[PDB]
Amino acid sequence: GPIRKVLLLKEDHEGLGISITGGKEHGVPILISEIHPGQPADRCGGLHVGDAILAVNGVNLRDTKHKEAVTILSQQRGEIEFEVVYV
Amino acid sequence: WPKSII
Description:
Chain A has 87 residues and is an alpha+beta fold. Chain A is 17% helix and 41% strand. By secondary structure, chain B is mostly beta strands. Chain B is built from no helices and 1 strand. Chain B has one strand at residues 3-5. Chain A binds chain B through residues 15-16, 18-23, 26, 28, 33-34, 36, 66-67, 70, 73-74, and chain B through 1-6.
């Protein structure tokens, strides 16, 4: 689908509210496998199961290993920009 | 594949 830019607002006591799978070592993108109800990703409205996360706050995740992506994603705070695409 | 809750 079209590449989308999506804003997410997270408080410091919360996670992103997603589960991710995939990663470079598996030959697939970082993919959203779950959106957890009521948590920041669900609340932001623009992130969905099946979206590939191409970048977060300008950091490209297209060639990142699974655990690299976890570290990068979990470091982001506050107003967080995502670049995503549903394929 | 691995799954991480984040």
